[PDB]
Structure 1
Amino acid sequence: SAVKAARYGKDNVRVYKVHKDEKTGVQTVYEMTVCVLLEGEIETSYTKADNSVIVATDSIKNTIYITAKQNPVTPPELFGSILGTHFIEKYNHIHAAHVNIVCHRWTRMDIDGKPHPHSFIRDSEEKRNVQVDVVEGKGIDIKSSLSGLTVLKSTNSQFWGFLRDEYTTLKETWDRILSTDVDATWQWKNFSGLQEVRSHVPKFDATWATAREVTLKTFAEDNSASVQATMYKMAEQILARQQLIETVEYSLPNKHYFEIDLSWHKGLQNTGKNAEVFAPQSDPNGLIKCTVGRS
């Protein structure tokens, strides 16, 4: 037998950083969860019990805190590239670093219409994420994403004209609820190294904001023919607005809300045009994915 692939590192490293403006007294906080996995010439730790090749996962954890102390942590695409580059440059035998970052929301509170200098609220479990793969001699590959964005529209969603055969019971509809949790990922063109990533720094926050805005607007305004058709419209617009993105992927659950027929009880009308009370279904759920690129 032989080692075909191996990677190891530290997962679930929680980090908080605060920035204090001495002039204004305004403080800004960042909180993330980080995972770093390394690859390289490490097979002998598996096959020969040779620990000399192992950068201890405890040391990886230390390195994350040290790097956060000495560098900006925003945008996360920059921080992840700095962190990944460190490992491949510092250790001769490590040839790839894989960095995943989840950014948690701490939104500045408004108290009496004014932004508070040092108090924050977690407004939703929506996350902004990055996956950064730093590979020695092959540059830096970055995938950025938003996830946990949960939305619902109460009308202007349809689903009719699908295949009907002996396995089909679903009725065609011209008016239904549509609800999903959005997971959207945009993949950047490959970067040659940290200098190139630094030159594009302003594009990271702007593209995140655009992806979010396009997602919300298209969801709210599209008279949706299916999840498939609506998500394609979102991905098309994002690609049109940022030339440095190569692909956009969406992964969308279809979270079903079922009509409840109440006619058995005193002829009460609660279906079709009379539907007011619905039963949200915890499971099963549709799951629809698509990756859109440039033609």
Structure 2
Amino acid sequence: NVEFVRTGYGKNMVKVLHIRREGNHHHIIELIANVQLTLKTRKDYLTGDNSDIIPTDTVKNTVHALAKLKGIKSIESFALDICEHFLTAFNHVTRVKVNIDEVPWKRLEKNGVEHNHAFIHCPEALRFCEAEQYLSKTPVVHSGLKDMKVLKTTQTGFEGFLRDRFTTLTDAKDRFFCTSVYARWRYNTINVAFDAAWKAVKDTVIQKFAGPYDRGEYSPSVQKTLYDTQLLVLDRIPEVEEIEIIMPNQHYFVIDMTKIGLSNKDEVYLPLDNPSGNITGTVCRKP
């Protein structure tokens, strides 16, 4: 009658912070990790036989443990070590997937001197990764950024679109563009400078969204902005193979005041939570 398409289990929301003291200067990294395992045997699902179960409490313990043993250089390398452990320290685990979120701790700073041990929370963008590996295979790593809220107040338009029966929207020479960018890309090798590449992607995203800093750059189409960014990432980082981007369109509308006898010449805007535009795209290297 039935057949397994997919199985997995583990422990989620494992929070951990690791510290590396070199002199008075403390290095910290705090992350929330989830690990999923796939077992060779399915006798746990079929007959309630636990003899193959590495308890989720043990998965928790292992994540804590590897953190002491391997230390934590990046969430991507940590994810890779979790993968390697469960694949090598056992023989009945066929797949392991680690997805990690990083807590965006920034070193406290006043005018170019950096506190040795104090940190502030300024999530410009949130960083995450994934590592997936099949038994004795070459593992695959994804990295990405999320919740990077940016706003432009000009140098965007939306004209030359299809009218149908339901279109009411007129051409717009000029209008605000606000988004909360999600980006996620696959590396074609494990051998990457991860903190450097992540920064590079982030910088590319903001720069092609905003710059040049004086007059900005006109963008006719959110689709095109998104795409040009996918091309600029693929030029700057040979180790990124595929990249995905999602950009919500968070709307700011000039509030029409004439029914109350005033003229609003593009001064007061309504920020509107719902609904929102959504523009997506995934491109990869021509193999």
Question: Residue 93 of structure 1: CA displacement?
Answer: 0.6
Alpha-carbon distance between aligned partners in 1 of 2:35 and 2:102, rounded to the nearest angstrom:
15
Q: Which moved more, 1:246-255 or 1:135-144?
A: 135-144
Q: 1:11 to 1:125 in 2, by over 3 A?
A: farther
Which residue among 253, 261, 264 is the counterpart of 1:258?
253
1:197-217 superposed Cα distances (whole Å, 9 cap, x missing partner):
3xx24x212111110111111
TM-score (norm 2): 0.94
CA–CA distance in structure 2, aligned partners of residues 40 and 292 of structure 1: 33
Specify the SS of the correspondent of 1:278: strand
Deviation, 1:288, is 1.0
Q: Find 2:205's aligned residue among 215, 226, 232.
A: 215
Residue 138 of structure 1 corresponds to which residue in structure 2?
137
Checking the alignment, whether the CA contact within 8 Å between 1:104 and 1:126 is kept in structure 2 is no
Please give the alpha-carbon distance, in whole angstroms, between the structure 2 residues aligned to 1:157 and 1:9.
46
The DSSP-based 3-state class of the residue aligned with 1:235 is helix
Give TM-score scaled by structure 1 length. Answer: 0.92
Q: For residues 96 and 205 of structure 1, do their structure 2 counterparts lie closer, same or farther at Cα, with a shift above 3 Å needed?
A: same
Residue 126 of structure 1: how far off its partner (Å)? 2.6
Q: What is the CA–CA distance in structure 2 between the aligned matches of 1:42 and 1:60, rounded to whole Å? A: 18
Percentage of pairs with the same residue: 34
Aligned equivalents of 1:169 and 1:240: distance in 2? 40
Runs of 4+ residues over 3 Å off in structure 1: none
276, 281, 284: which one aligns with 1:290: 281
Letter in 1 for 2:204: V
Q: How does 1:42-121 map to 2 (within 5 A)?
A: 42-111=41-110, 113-121=112-120
SS in structure 2 of the partner of residue 53 of structure 1: coil
Matched, 1:281 2:282: no
Q: Counterparts in 2 of 1:143-162, with a 5 A limit?
A: 143-162=142-161
User: What is the rounded CA distance, in whole Å, between the counterparts of 1:260 and 1:93 in structure 2?
Assistant: 62
CA distance in 1, matches of 2:137, 2:278: 34
Contact residue 87 and residue 136 of structure 2 kept, 8 A: no
Give the count of matched residue pairs: 280
Partner of 1:194: none
1:36-90 deviations in Å (ceiling 9; x for gaps): 0001213110001110011000000000000011113222211111111100111
Distance 1:263 1:163 in 2: 29
Change (3 A) 1:43 1:288: same
Instruction: Give the superposed CA RMSD.
Output: 1.3
Gaps of 5+ in 2: 212-216
Query: Hey, what's the Cα distance between the residues in 2 that align with 1:15 and 1:53?
Result: 27
Q: Distance in 2 between matches of 1:233 and 1:288?
A: 14
In 2, Cα distance between equivalents of 1:224 and 1:269: 28
Deviation at 1:106, TM superposition (A): 1.0
Measure the CA separation in 1 of the matches of 2:260 and 2:74: 57
- Show the counterpart of 2:214: none
CA distance in 2, matches of 1:263, 1:35: 54
Tell me which residue corresponds to 1:234: 229
Aligned residue for 2:35?
36
Q: Could you tell me which residue of structure 1 aligns to residue 194 of structure 2?
A: 204
Unaligned runs of 5+ residues in structure 1 are 192-196
Q: Report the Cα offset of residue 113 of structure 1.
A: 4.4
Q: CA deviation at 1:112?
A: 5.7
Q: Distance in 2 between matches of 1:113 and 1:86?
A: 41
Once the two structures are TM-superposed, the CA of residue 2 in structure 1 deviates from its matched residue by 3.0
Give the partner amino acid of 2:96: A
The alpha carbon displacement at 1:151 in A equals: 0.3
Match of residue 20 from structure 2: 19
SS state of the match for residue 258, structure 2? coil
Q: What secondary structure sits across from 1:282 in the alignment?
A: coil
State the Cα deviation string for residues 228-254 of structure 1 (Å, max 9, x = none): 110111110000111111111101111
